[PDB]
Protein backbone atom coordinates (compact mmCIF):
# COMPACT_ATOMS: atom_id res chain seq x y z
CA UNK A 1 0.00 0.00 0.00
CA UNK A 2 2.91 1.98 0.15
CA UNK A 3 3.27 2.59 -3.57
CA UNK A 4 -0.02 4.39 -3.42
CA UNK A 5 0.76 8.27 -4.47
CA UNK A 6 3.95 7.58 -6.22
CA UNK A 7 4.11 8.63 -9.99
CA UNK A 8 6.62 6.43 -11.01
CA UNK A 9 4.80 3.12 -10.19
CA UNK A 10 5.05 -0.22 -11.86
CA UNK A 11 1.90 -2.24 -12.13
CA UNK A 12 3.76 -6.30 -12.78
CA UNK A 13 1.40 -9.33 -13.23
CA UNK A 14 2.76 -12.97 -12.91
CA UNK A 15 1.53 -16.01 -14.79
CA UNK A 16 0.81 -18.28 -11.68
CA UNK A 17 7.04 -16.36 -10.48
CA UNK A 18 7.91 -12.44 -12.30
CA UNK A 19 10.72 -9.73 -12.85
CA UNK A 20 10.69 -6.78 -10.91
CA UNK A 21 13.35 -3.27 -11.56
CA UNK A 22 13.75 -1.87 -8.47
CA UNK A 23 15.31 1.78 -8.24
CA UNK A 24 15.82 5.51 -5.91
CA UNK A 25 12.38 6.83 -6.87
CA UNK A 26 10.59 3.87 -8.32
CA UNK A 27 7.74 1.74 -6.78
CA UNK A 28 6.51 -1.65 -8.00
CA UNK A 29 2.82 -2.91 -7.39
CA UNK A 30 2.89 -6.88 -7.88
CA UNK A 31 0.01 -9.18 -8.69
CA UNK A 32 -0.43 -12.53 -8.62
CA UNK A 33 -3.60 -15.17 -9.04
CA UNK A 34 -4.68 -15.94 -5.15
CA UNK A 35 -1.81 -14.06 -3.81
CA UNK A 36 -1.36 -11.25 -1.98
CA UNK A 37 -0.85 -7.83 -4.05
CA UNK A 38 2.80 -6.62 -2.92
CA UNK A 39 4.45 -3.46 -2.83
CA UNK A 40 8.28 -3.06 -3.66
CA UNK A 41 9.93 0.15 -3.18
CA UNK A 42 14.30 0.67 -2.84
CA UNK A 43 14.70 2.64 0.20
CA UNK A 44 18.47 2.77 0.81
CA UNK A 45 21.80 1.93 -0.79
CA UNK A 46 25.23 1.83 0.92
CA UNK A 47 28.37 1.13 0.36
CA UNK A 48 29.49 -1.06 3.73
CA UNK A 49 32.98 -1.72 3.48
CA UNK A 50 34.41 1.55 1.99
CA UNK A 51 38.38 1.94 1.72
CA UNK A 52 39.49 5.53 1.75
CA UNK A 53 42.42 5.72 -0.64
CA UNK A 54 43.43 9.37 -0.25
CA UNK A 55 41.80 12.67 1.53
CA UNK A 56 42.34 15.53 -0.50
CA UNK A 57 42.24 19.65 0.94
CA UNK A 58 40.37 21.85 -1.73
CA UNK A 59 40.24 24.78 0.88
CA UNK A 60 43.50 25.66 2.62
CA UNK A 61 43.75 27.95 5.49
CA UNK A 62 47.27 29.53 6.69
CA UNK A 63 47.62 30.10 10.49
CA UNK A 64 50.46 30.57 13.38
CA UNK A 65 53.03 32.58 10.58
CA UNK A 66 56.44 32.51 12.13
CA UNK A 67 59.01 34.30 10.85
CA UNK A 68 63.13 34.20 11.60
CA UNK A 69 66.32 36.22 9.72
CA UNK A 70 69.93 36.22 10.18
CA UNK A 71 72.60 38.77 9.22
CA UNK A 72 74.65 37.71 6.41
CA UNK A 73 77.57 35.38 7.20
CA UNK A 74 75.69 34.61 10.77
CA UNK A 75 74.17 31.14 9.42
CA UNK A 76 71.09 29.66 7.96
CA UNK A 77 67.79 30.64 10.22
CA UNK A 78 65.90 28.05 12.01
CA UNK A 79 62.19 27.39 13.79
CA UNK A 80 61.23 24.69 15.68
CA UNK A 81 57.88 24.82 13.67
CA UNK A 82 60.31 23.67 10.46
CA UNK A 83 59.84 19.90 12.68
CA UNK A 84 56.47 20.31 13.12
CA UNK A 85 54.74 18.61 10.17
CA UNK A 86 51.65 20.90 10.62
CA UNK A 87 53.49 23.80 9.19
CA UNK A 88 54.88 24.70 6.26
CA UNK A 89 58.43 26.23 5.87
CA UNK A 90 60.59 27.74 3.27
CA UNK A 91 64.24 29.65 3.47
CA UNK A 92 65.27 32.28 1.22
CA UNK A 93 67.27 35.18 0.98
CA UNK A 94 66.93 38.88 1.80
CA UNK A 95 69.14 42.28 1.28
CA UNK A 96 71.25 43.22 4.10
CA UNK A 97 72.88 46.54 5.37
CA UNK A 98 73.61 48.83 7.41
CA UNK A 99 70.04 50.58 7.65
CA UNK A 100 68.73 47.24 7.67
CA UNK A 101 70.38 45.90 10.97
CA UNK A 102 73.27 44.40 10.09
CA UNK A 103 77.01 45.15 10.43
CA UNK A 104 77.74 43.88 6.61
CA UNK A 105 76.11 44.07 3.22
CA UNK A 106 74.70 40.99 1.43
CA UNK A 107 72.45 38.56 1.47
CA UNK A 108 70.58 37.28 4.91
CA UNK A 109 69.12 33.80 5.25
CA UNK A 110 64.99 34.42 5.62
CA UNK A 111 63.02 31.65 6.93
CA UNK A 112 58.91 31.61 7.29
CA UNK A 113 56.82 29.06 8.67
CA UNK A 114 52.73 28.83 8.96
CA UNK A 115 50.23 26.42 10.37
CA UNK A 116 48.66 24.31 7.21
CA UNK A 117 44.88 23.56 8.25
CA UNK A 118 42.38 22.31 6.13
CA UNK A 119 38.94 24.03 5.61
CA UNK A 120 37.04 21.56 3.40
CA UNK A 121 38.20 18.41 1.88
CA UNK A 122 37.35 15.74 -0.68
CA UNK A 123 37.70 11.68 0.15
CA UNK A 124 37.95 8.96 -2.42
CA UNK A 125 36.28 5.81 -1.19
CA UNK A 126 37.13 2.37 -3.10
CA UNK A 127 33.74 0.31 -2.89
CA UNK A 128 33.57 -3.50 -3.25
CA UNK A 129 30.77 -4.18 -5.68
CA UNK A 130 29.58 -6.92 -3.42
CA UNK A 131 29.06 -5.07 -0.46
CA UNK A 132 26.62 -2.70 -1.84
CA UNK A 133 24.03 -3.13 0.75
CA UNK A 134 20.52 -2.74 -0.51
CA UNK A 135 17.33 -2.23 1.30
CA UNK A 136 13.95 -3.22 0.15
CA UNK A 137 10.53 -2.67 1.36
CA UNK A 138 8.05 -4.96 1.06
CA UNK A 139 4.38 -3.85 1.81
CA UNK A 140 1.72 -6.37 1.08
CA UNK A 141 -1.91 -5.28 0.49
CA UNK A 142 -3.41 -5.50 3.98
CA UNK A 143 -5.83 -2.59 3.70
CA UNK A 144 -4.67 -1.24 7.22
CA UNK A 145 -6.54 2.70 7.81
CA UNK A 146 -2.94 3.55 7.99
CA UNK A 147 -0.90 1.53 5.15
CA UNK A 148 -1.60 3.71 2.31
CA UNK A 149 1.70 5.31 1.60
CA UNK A 150 2.90 5.15 5.08
CA UNK A 151 6.64 5.71 4.37
CA UNK A 152 7.33 4.19 8.01
CA UNK A 153 7.15 1.04 7.08
CA UNK A 154 5.83 -0.85 10.41
CA UNK A 155 3.62 -1.82 8.04
CA UNK A 156 5.99 -3.75 5.32
CA UNK A 157 8.94 -5.91 6.17
CA UNK A 158 12.89 -4.43 5.34
CA UNK A 159 15.02 -6.72 3.83
CA UNK A 160 18.75 -6.55 2.66
CA UNK A 161 20.31 -7.42 -0.27
CA UNK A 162 24.00 -7.82 -1.23
CA UNK A 163 25.27 -8.05 -5.37
CA UNK A 164 26.45 -11.27 -4.23
CA UNK A 165 23.97 -12.64 -1.04
CA UNK A 166 20.87 -11.97 -3.88
CA UNK A 167 19.14 -15.35 -3.04
CA UNK A 168 16.69 -13.97 0.26
CA UNK A 169 13.31 -15.75 1.48
CA UNK A 170 11.22 -12.86 3.03
CA UNK A 171 8.74 -13.46 5.75
CA UNK A 172 5.18 -11.37 5.59
CA UNK A 173 3.50 -11.61 8.91
CA UNK A 174 0.39 -13.29 7.98
CA UNK A 175 1.08 -14.08 4.15
CA UNK A 176 3.98 -16.57 4.04
CA UNK A 177 7.17 -15.85 2.54
CA UNK A 178 8.62 -14.34 -0.70
CA UNK A 179 11.72 -15.70 -2.71
CA UNK A 180 13.76 -12.77 -3.95
CA UNK A 181 16.62 -13.33 -6.20
CA UNK A 182 18.28 -10.17 -7.09
CA UNK A 183 21.35 -9.28 -9.37
CA UNK A 184 22.85 -5.07 -9.94
CA UNK A 185 22.29 -3.56 -12.64
CA UNK A 186 24.53 -0.53 -12.13
CA UNK A 187 25.92 2.09 -14.51
CA UNK A 188 29.16 1.59 -13.94
CA UNK A 189 31.43 -1.26 -12.40
CA UNK A 190 33.64 -0.14 -9.14
CA UNK A 191 36.27 -2.20 -11.07
CA UNK A 192 39.31 0.78 -11.24
CA UNK A 193 36.85 3.74 -9.58
CA UNK A 194 36.82 5.48 -7.07
CA UNK A 195 33.56 7.05 -5.74
CA UNK A 196 34.84 10.90 -4.86
CA UNK A 197 32.73 11.85 -2.08
CA UNK A 198 32.80 15.78 -1.97
CA UNK A 199 30.04 17.26 0.51
CA UNK A 200 26.45 16.55 -0.44
CA UNK A 201 27.86 15.00 -3.83
CA UNK A 202 29.54 12.07 -5.05
CA UNK A 203 31.38 10.67 -8.69
CA UNK A 204 32.73 8.02 -10.00
CA UNK A 205 36.02 8.58 -11.22
CA UNK A 206 39.12 6.69 -12.85
CA UNK A 207 41.24 5.24 -10.14
CA UNK A 208 44.98 7.02 -11.95
CA UNK A 209 42.82 9.89 -12.23
CA UNK A 210 41.83 10.78 -8.61
CA UNK A 211 45.41 9.59 -7.35
CA UNK A 212 47.16 12.49 -9.50
CA UNK A 213 45.01 15.68 -8.67
CA UNK A 214 47.82 18.35 -7.37
CA UNK A 215 46.36 19.16 -4.50
CA UNK A 216 47.34 18.39 -0.78
CA UNK A 217 46.64 15.09 0.69
CA UNK A 218 46.28 12.31 3.61
CA UNK A 219 46.73 8.83 3.33
CA UNK A 220 44.02 6.19 3.99
CA UNK A 221 46.44 5.10 6.85
CA UNK A 222 45.98 8.80 8.41
CA UNK A 223 42.19 9.78 8.53
CA UNK A 224 46.04 13.18 10.92
CA UNK A 225 47.56 16.30 10.89
CA UNK A 226 50.52 16.05 8.59
CA UNK A 227 48.89 16.47 5.04
CA UNK A 228 51.77 15.52 1.99
CA UNK A 229 51.97 18.19 -0.66
CA UNK A 230 51.03 21.49 1.13
CA UNK A 231 53.25 23.29 -1.79
CA UNK A 232 50.19 22.41 -4.16
CA UNK A 233 48.01 25.09 -2.41
CA UNK A 234 51.00 27.14 -0.67
CA UNK A 235 53.00 29.65 -2.23
CA UNK A 236 55.77 31.40 -1.13
CA UNK A 237 56.30 34.82 -2.54
CA UNK A 238 59.79 36.92 -2.07
CA UNK A 239 60.18 39.24 -5.18
CA UNK A 240 62.54 42.09 -4.49
CA UNK A 241 65.05 40.38 -1.71
CA UNK A 242 63.36 42.32 0.75
CA UNK A 243 60.57 40.36 2.86
CA UNK A 244 59.03 36.65 2.53
CA UNK A 245 55.25 36.26 2.53
CA UNK A 246 53.13 32.90 2.41
CA UNK A 247 50.07 32.83 0.29
CA UNK A 248 47.11 30.36 -0.18
CA UNK A 249 45.88 29.50 -3.47
CA UNK A 250 42.56 29.60 -2.98
CA UNK A 251 39.19 26.79 -2.87
CA UNK A 252 39.50 24.39 -5.62
CA UNK A 253 36.11 23.30 -4.99
CA UNK A 254 34.32 25.07 -7.80
CA UNK A 255 37.76 24.24 -9.95
CA UNK A 256 36.84 20.49 -9.22
CA UNK A 257 33.47 20.57 -10.11
CA UNK A 258 34.09 21.84 -13.47
CA UNK A 259 36.52 18.80 -13.87
CA UNK A 260 34.02 16.24 -12.56
CA UNK A 261 31.58 16.93 -15.59
CA UNK A 262 32.76 14.38 -17.87
CA UNK A 263 31.95 12.34 -14.75
CA UNK A 264 29.02 10.14 -13.49
CA UNK A 265 27.39 11.72 -10.87
CA UNK A 266 25.81 9.94 -7.33
CA UNK A 267 23.59 11.79 -4.79
CA UNK A 268 25.16 11.50 -1.38
CA UNK A 269 23.81 11.42 2.26
CA UNK A 270 26.33 11.00 5.24
CA UNK A 271 27.38 7.30 3.85
CA UNK A 272 24.65 6.52 2.10
CA UNK A 273 23.77 6.44 -1.59
CA UNK A 274 20.82 7.29 -3.83
CA UNK A 275 22.53 5.62 -6.73
CA UNK A 276 20.87 6.29 -10.31
CA UNK A 277 21.55 2.11 -11.47
CA UNK A 278 18.79 -0.71 -11.58
CA UNK A 279 18.37 -3.90 -9.50
CA UNK A 280 17.15 -6.50 -11.48
CA UNK A 281 15.45 -8.66 -9.00
CA UNK A 282 12.92 -12.26 -9.72
CA UNK A 283 10.30 -13.70 -7.11
CA UNK A 284 8.31 -16.38 -6.48
CA UNK A 285 4.37 -16.13 -4.74
CA UNK A 286 4.89 -20.43 -4.48
CA UNK A 287 5.20 -20.06 -0.62
CA UNK A 288 2.77 -16.81 -0.53
CA UNK A 289 -0.81 -17.30 0.43
CA UNK A 290 -3.86 -14.63 1.23
CA UNK A 291 -4.56 -13.66 4.94
CA UNK A 292 -7.72 -15.32 5.62
CA UNK A 293 -9.76 -16.59 2.22
CA UNK A 294 -11.35 -19.39 4.69
CA UNK A 295 -13.48 -16.17 6.47
CA UNK A 296 -16.94 -15.54 5.59
CA UNK A 297 -18.69 -12.64 3.54
CA UNK A 298 -19.55 -9.75 5.56
CA UNK A 299 -23.21 -9.69 6.88
CA UNK A 300 -23.28 -6.03 7.88
CA UNK A 301 -23.13 -3.03 6.13
CA UNK A 302 -20.68 -0.65 5.46
CA UNK A 303 -19.65 3.25 5.77
CA UNK A 304 -17.18 5.28 3.53
CA UNK A 305 -15.26 7.25 6.06
CA UNK A 306 -12.80 8.95 3.56
CA UNK A 307 -13.78 10.43 -0.06
CA UNK A 308 -12.64 8.68 -2.78
CA UNK A 309 -9.50 9.54 -4.30
CA UNK A 310 -8.13 8.51 -7.74
CA UNK A 311 -4.47 7.95 -8.25
CA UNK A 312 -1.88 9.65 -10.65
CA UNK A 313 -2.44 5.97 -12.73
CA UNK A 314 -6.18 6.06 -12.80
CA UNK A 315 -6.60 3.40 -9.78
CA UNK A 316 -9.08 4.67 -7.05
CA UNK A 317 -8.73 4.27 -2.77
CA UNK A 318 -11.91 3.78 -1.04
CA UNK A 319 -11.35 3.99 2.99
CA UNK A 320 -14.54 1.78 3.83
CA UNK A 321 -15.39 1.18 8.20
CA UNK A 322 -17.58 -1.73 8.90
CA UNK A 323 -20.67 -1.06 10.93
CA UNK A 324 -22.18 -4.84 11.41
CA UNK A 325 -21.17 -7.69 12.97
CA UNK A 326 -19.23 -10.87 12.08
CA UNK A 327 -14.84 -9.78 12.47
CA UNK A 328 -12.60 -11.07 11.42
CA UNK A 329 -14.79 -10.38 8.83
CA UNK A 330 -14.38 -10.75 4.54
CA UNK A 331 -15.75 -7.48 2.47
CA UNK A 332 -18.27 -8.00 -0.75
CA UNK A 333 -16.21 -5.71 -3.28
CA UNK A 334 -17.97 -5.49 -6.97
CA UNK A 335 -17.52 -2.66 -9.65
CA UNK A 336 -20.14 -3.12 -12.11
CA UNK A 337 -21.31 -0.86 -14.86
CA UNK A 338 -25.11 1.32 -14.26
CA UNK A 339 -26.92 -1.73 -15.48
CA UNK A 340 -25.09 -4.14 -13.03
CA UNK A 341 -24.74 -6.91 -15.90
CA UNK A 342 -21.39 -7.32 -15.72
CA UNK A 343 -18.68 -6.96 -13.09
CA UNK A 344 -15.85 -4.63 -14.42
CA UNK A 345 -13.41 -3.25 -12.56
CA UNK A 346 -10.17 -5.29 -11.29
CA UNK A 347 -9.33 -4.95 -8.20
CA UNK A 348 -5.87 -3.95 -6.78
CA UNK A 349 -6.18 -4.36 -3.06
CA UNK A 350 -7.06 -8.54 -3.82
CA UNK A 351 -9.34 -9.86 -1.36
CA UNK A 352 -10.46 -7.56 1.37
CA UNK A 353 -10.84 -8.19 4.64
CA UNK A 354 -12.40 -6.56 8.20
CA UNK A 355 -9.91 -7.31 10.97
CA UNK A 356 -11.84 -5.10 13.84
CA UNK A 357 -14.67 -3.25 13.05
CA UNK A 358 -13.49 0.08 14.71
CA UNK A 359 -10.65 -0.24 11.76
CA UNK A 360 -11.43 0.91 8.56
CA UNK A 361 -10.00 -0.80 5.63
CA UNK A 362 -8.68 1.21 2.49
CA UNK A 363 -9.39 -0.75 -0.53
CA UNK A 364 -7.54 0.07 -4.28
CA UNK A 365 -8.86 -1.14 -7.38
CA UNK A 366 -8.69 -0.01 -10.83
CA UNK A 367 -12.15 1.10 -12.28
CA UNK A 368 -13.37 0.82 -15.64
CA UNK A 369 -13.22 3.87 -18.41
CA UNK A 370 -16.55 6.24 -18.16
CA UNK A 371 -19.66 5.24 -15.65
CA UNK A 372 -19.27 2.55 -13.04
CA UNK A 373 -20.75 1.37 -10.15
CA UNK A 374 -18.64 1.03 -6.77
CA UNK A 375 -20.38 -1.95 -4.73
CA UNK A 376 -19.13 -2.39 -1.45
CA UNK A 377 -21.10 -4.96 1.02
CA UNK A 378 -24.37 -6.64 0.55
CA UNK A 379 -27.85 -6.07 0.99
CA UNK A 380 -29.30 -4.12 3.16
CA UNK A 381 -27.18 -0.91 3.45
CA UNK A 382 -25.06 -1.87 -0.04
CA UNK A 383 -22.74 0.87 -0.94
CA UNK A 384 -23.77 2.57 -4.07
CA UNK A 385 -20.97 5.00 -5.22
CA UNK A 386 -21.14 5.96 -8.77
CA UNK A 387 -17.47 6.92 -10.47
CA UNK A 388 -16.50 8.84 -13.37
CA UNK A 389 -13.19 7.78 -15.30
CA UNK A 390 -12.27 10.05 -18.71
CA UNK B 1 56.73 61.01 22.75
CA UNK B 2 53.72 59.45 24.62
CA UNK B 3 52.39 56.26 24.74
CA UNK B 4 48.20 55.73 26.03
CA UNK B 5 46.71 53.07 26.94
CA UNK B 6 43.27 52.13 27.35
CA UNK B 7 40.68 48.83 27.96
CA UNK B 8 41.49 47.70 31.44
CA UNK B 9 39.34 47.20 34.57
CA UNK B 10 37.20 44.45 36.11
CA UNK B 11 37.02 40.67 34.01
CA UNK B 12 35.19 37.83 35.16
CA UNK B 13 36.98 34.17 35.38
CA UNK B 14 37.51 33.24 31.64
CA UNK B 15 36.79 36.03 30.44
CA UNK B 16 38.05 38.27 27.58
CA UNK B 17 39.59 42.07 27.55
CA UNK B 18 40.73 44.23 24.89
CA UNK B 19 43.66 46.74 25.38
CA UNK B 20 44.36 49.33 23.39
CA UNK B 21 47.51 51.81 23.12
CA UNK B 22 47.89 54.88 21.36
CA UNK B 23 51.06 56.39 19.85
CA UNK B 24 52.40 59.65 19.15
CA UNK B 25 55.41 61.51 18.87
CA UNK B 26 57.61 59.13 16.45
CA UNK B 27 57.05 57.07 12.98
CA UNK B 28 55.33 54.61 14.56
CA UNK B 29 55.34 52.51 11.88
CA UNK B 30 58.85 52.00 12.12
CA UNK B 31 59.24 50.60 15.69
CA UNK B 32 58.68 46.88 17.30
CA UNK B 33 56.12 47.04 20.20
CA UNK B 34 55.89 45.37 23.34
CA UNK B 35 53.45 44.55 25.79
CA UNK B 36 54.66 44.23 29.37
CA UNK B 37 52.97 43.70 32.82
CA UNK B 38 53.41 43.96 36.47
CA UNK B 39 50.96 42.35 39.41
CA UNK B 40 50.06 44.85 42.11
CA UNK B 41 53.25 45.48 44.02
CA UNK B 42 55.34 42.71 42.03
CA UNK B 43 57.80 42.15 39.17
CA UNK B 44 57.46 43.34 35.22
CA UNK B 45 56.62 40.32 33.33
CA UNK B 46 57.32 40.21 29.35
CA UNK B 47 54.21 39.65 28.01
CA UNK B 48 54.33 40.08 23.83
CA UNK B 49 55.86 41.97 20.85
CA UNK B 50 55.29 42.78 17.66
CA UNK B 51 57.36 43.83 14.29
CA UNK B 52 56.17 46.48 12.00
CA UNK B 53 54.51 44.03 9.55
CA UNK B 54 52.81 42.38 12.01
CA UNK B 55 54.82 39.10 10.05
CA UNK B 56 56.30 38.68 13.66
CA UNK B 57 54.28 38.30 16.97
CA UNK B 58 56.16 36.54 19.53
CA UNK B 59 54.52 35.91 23.12
CA UNK B 60 55.57 34.70 26.59
CA UNK B 61 54.94 30.77 27.91
CA UNK B 62 52.25 31.93 29.76
CA UNK B 63 50.18 32.85 27.02
CA UNK B 64 49.94 29.59 26.03
CA UNK B 65 48.00 31.78 22.97
CA UNK B 66 45.58 32.67 24.89
CA UNK B 67 46.77 36.87 23.64
CA UNK B 68 46.76 38.14 20.45
CA UNK B 69 49.08 41.45 19.85
CA UNK B 70 48.16 43.69 16.96
CA UNK B 71 48.74 47.08 15.57
CA UNK B 72 46.91 49.86 12.93
CA UNK B 73 49.77 51.85 11.72
CA UNK B 74 47.93 54.46 9.92
CA UNK B 75 45.85 55.07 13.43
CA UNK B 76 49.35 54.99 15.37
CA UNK B 77 47.71 52.20 17.73
CA UNK B 78 48.59 48.74 19.17
CA UNK B 79 46.18 46.19 20.91
CA UNK B 80 46.19 43.25 23.15
CA UNK B 81 43.34 40.71 22.62
CA UNK B 82 43.27 39.26 25.79
CA UNK B 83 41.03 35.39 26.33
CA UNK B 84 40.62 32.86 29.03
CA UNK B 85 41.85 35.26 31.67
CA UNK B 86 42.46 34.08 35.24
CA UNK B 87 43.63 35.36 38.62
CA UNK B 88 47.40 35.10 37.42
CA UNK B 89 46.78 37.48 34.68
CA UNK B 90 45.46 40.47 37.12
CA UNK B 91 48.08 43.35 36.41
CA UNK B 92 49.17 46.93 35.14
CA UNK B 93 49.37 46.57 31.60
CA UNK B 94 51.90 48.36 30.19
CA UNK B 95 52.41 49.57 26.11
CA UNK B 96 55.93 49.64 25.53
CA UNK B 97 58.40 50.80 22.47
CA UNK B 98 61.68 49.24 21.74
CA UNK B 99 63.64 52.61 20.68
CA UNK B 100 66.89 51.05 20.28
CA UNK B 101 66.76 48.34 17.41
CA UNK B 102 65.18 51.27 15.58
CA UNK B 103 68.99 52.68 15.44
CA UNK B 104 69.47 49.30 13.63
CA UNK B 105 66.91 48.12 11.57
CA UNK B 106 65.28 51.76 10.62
CA UNK B 107 61.93 49.29 9.12
CA UNK B 108 61.25 47.63 12.05
CA UNK B 109 60.97 44.71 10.05
CA UNK B 110 63.78 42.00 10.12
CA UNK B 111 63.30 39.27 13.02
CA UNK B 112 66.75 38.70 13.90
CA UNK B 113 67.53 36.27 16.70
CA UNK B 114 68.59 37.61 20.07
CA UNK B 115 68.85 41.39 18.42
CA UNK B 116 70.00 44.77 20.23
CA UNK B 117 66.99 46.14 22.26
CA UNK B 118 65.67 48.68 24.60
CA UNK B 119 62.29 49.28 25.83
CA UNK B 120 63.01 53.45 26.06
CA UNK B 121 59.64 54.71 26.15
CA UNK B 122 56.67 53.35 28.53
CA UNK B 123 53.36 54.64 28.83
CA UNK B 124 51.22 54.98 32.28
CA UNK B 125 49.68 51.22 32.15
CA UNK B 126 46.02 50.42 32.13
CA UNK B 127 44.76 47.64 35.15
CA UNK B 128 43.02 44.82 34.23
CA UNK B 129 41.42 42.96 37.36
CA UNK B 130 40.45 39.21 36.75
CA UNK B 131 37.60 38.32 39.68
CA UNK B 132 34.61 35.71 40.03
CA UNK C 1 65.01 28.85 27.75
CA UNK C 2 66.64 31.42 30.22
CA UNK C 3 65.83 32.80 33.73
CA UNK C 4 67.33 35.74 35.20
CA UNK C 5 67.60 36.21 38.78
CA UNK C 6 68.48 39.54 41.05
CA UNK C 7 68.98 39.84 44.85
CA UNK C 8 65.97 40.62 46.76
CA UNK C 9 67.46 43.70 47.99
CA UNK C 10 70.57 46.06 48.65
CA UNK C 11 71.15 48.49 51.33
CA UNK C 12 73.57 51.28 51.16
CA UNK C 13 74.06 54.39 52.38
CA UNK C 14 74.12 58.27 50.54
CA UNK C 15 77.46 58.75 48.65
CA UNK C 16 78.24 55.08 48.55
CA UNK C 17 78.96 53.23 45.53
CA UNK C 18 76.35 49.95 45.21
CA UNK C 19 76.16 46.94 42.74
CA UNK C 20 72.84 45.09 41.61
CA UNK C 21 73.46 41.24 40.27
CA UNK C 22 71.60 40.09 37.37
CA UNK C 23 72.34 36.28 36.66
CA UNK C 24 70.90 33.07 34.57
CA UNK C 25 70.46 29.24 34.75
CA UNK C 26 70.20 28.71 30.70
CA UNK C 27 72.23 31.48 29.94
CA UNK C 28 75.55 32.48 27.80
CA UNK C 29 77.81 35.18 27.00
CA UNK C 30 74.66 36.60 24.52
CA UNK C 31 71.95 36.93 27.61
CA UNK C 32 74.47 39.65 29.44
CA UNK C 33 75.41 40.93 25.77
CA UNK C 34 71.74 42.22 25.44
CA UNK C 35 70.92 42.64 29.03
CA UNK C 36 68.63 46.24 30.09
CA UNK C 37 68.52 47.70 33.04
CA UNK C 38 65.15 49.45 34.12
CA UNK C 39 64.66 51.45 37.70
CA UNK C 40 61.27 51.73 38.77
CA UNK C 41 59.98 54.36 41.41
CA UNK C 42 57.00 53.38 43.62
CA UNK C 43 53.99 54.05 41.64
CA UNK C 44 55.79 55.39 38.72
CA UNK C 45 56.38 53.57 34.94
CA UNK C 46 59.88 51.84 34.91
CA UNK C 47 62.42 53.84 32.96
CA UNK C 48 65.26 52.15 30.98
CA UNK C 49 68.68 53.06 32.71
CA UNK C 50 70.96 51.24 30.59
CA UNK C 51 70.75 48.95 27.48
CA UNK C 52 73.46 46.38 25.49
CA UNK C 53 75.18 45.35 28.74
CA UNK C 54 76.74 48.46 29.01
CA UNK C 55 75.15 51.19 27.00
CA UNK C 56 73.50 54.35 28.84
CA UNK C 57 70.98 56.25 26.87
CA UNK C 58 71.21 60.11 27.32
CA UNK C 59 69.12 61.62 30.22
CA UNK C 60 70.18 58.72 32.68
CA UNK C 61 72.54 60.19 35.15
CA UNK C 62 76.69 59.72 34.93
CA UNK C 63 76.29 58.45 38.22
CA UNK C 64 74.83 54.91 36.53
CA UNK C 65 77.30 52.42 35.18
CA UNK C 66 76.96 48.60 34.10
CA UNK C 67 79.73 45.70 33.22
CA UNK C 68 78.60 42.41 32.11
CA UNK C 69 80.81 38.93 31.91
CA UNK C 70 80.09 36.00 30.35
CA UNK C 71 77.93 34.20 33.74
CA UNK C 72 76.05 37.78 34.49
CA UNK C 73 75.52 41.19 34.25
CA UNK C 74 75.35 44.46 36.73
CA UNK C 75 74.25 47.72 37.54
CA UNK C 76 76.73 50.35 39.29
CA UNK C 77 75.29 53.29 41.01
CA UNK C 78 78.12 55.02 42.13
CA UNK C 79 77.10 58.66 44.76
CA UNK C 80 73.88 56.43 46.04
CA UNK C 81 71.01 59.18 46.32
CA UNK C 82 67.78 59.39 48.44
CA UNK C 83 65.85 59.49 44.71
CA UNK C 84 67.48 56.32 43.56
CA UNK C 85 65.61 54.51 46.24
CA UNK C 86 63.20 52.33 43.69
CA UNK C 87 63.43 48.92 42.34
CA UNK C 88 65.45 47.65 40.14
CA UNK C 89 64.68 44.86 37.20
CA UNK C 90 67.17 43.65 34.49
CA UNK C 91 65.68 42.12 31.32
CA UNK C 92 67.09 39.86 28.34
CA UNK C 93 66.18 37.36 25.45
CA UNK C 94 64.62 34.30 27.12
CA UNK C 95 64.88 32.57 23.55
CA UNK C 96 65.84 33.37 20.37
CA UNK C 97 62.29 35.38 19.95
CA UNK C 98 61.25 36.18 23.03
CA UNK C 99 62.44 38.51 26.36
CA UNK C 100 62.31 38.30 29.91
CA UNK C 101 62.86 40.37 32.97
CA UNK C 102 64.36 39.53 36.52
CA UNK C 103 62.71 39.32 39.71
CA UNK C 104 63.63 43.06 40.71
CA UNK C 105 65.88 44.39 43.44
CA UNK C 106 64.65 46.91 45.90
CA UNK C 107 67.12 49.39 46.71
CA UNK C 108 67.03 50.88 49.97
CA UNK C 109 68.83 54.17 50.67
CA UNK C 110 69.33 53.86 54.37
CA UNK C 111 67.85 56.58 56.56
Known amino acids: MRCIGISNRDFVEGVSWVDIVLEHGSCVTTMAKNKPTLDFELIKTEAKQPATLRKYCIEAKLTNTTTESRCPTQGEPSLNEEQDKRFICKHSMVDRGWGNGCGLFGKGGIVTCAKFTCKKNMEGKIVQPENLEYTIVITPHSGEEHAVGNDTGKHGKEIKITPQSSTTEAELTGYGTVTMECSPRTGLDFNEMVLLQMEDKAWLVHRQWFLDLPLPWLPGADTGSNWIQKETLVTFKNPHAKKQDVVVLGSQEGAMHTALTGATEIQMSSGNLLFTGHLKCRLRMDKLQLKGMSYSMCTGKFKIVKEIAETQHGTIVIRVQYEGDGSPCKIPFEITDLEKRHVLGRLITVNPIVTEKDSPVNIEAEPPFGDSYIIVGVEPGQLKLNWLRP | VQLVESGGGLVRPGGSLRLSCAASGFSYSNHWMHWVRQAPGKGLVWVSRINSDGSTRNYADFVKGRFTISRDNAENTLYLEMNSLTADDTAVYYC??????????????????????????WGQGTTVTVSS | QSVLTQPVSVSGSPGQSITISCTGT?????????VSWYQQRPGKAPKLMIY???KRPSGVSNRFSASKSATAASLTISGLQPEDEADYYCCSYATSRTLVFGGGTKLTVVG
Open chain 3, 26 to 34: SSNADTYNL
Open chain 2, 96 to 121: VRDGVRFYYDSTGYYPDSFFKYGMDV
Open chain 3, 52 to 54: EGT
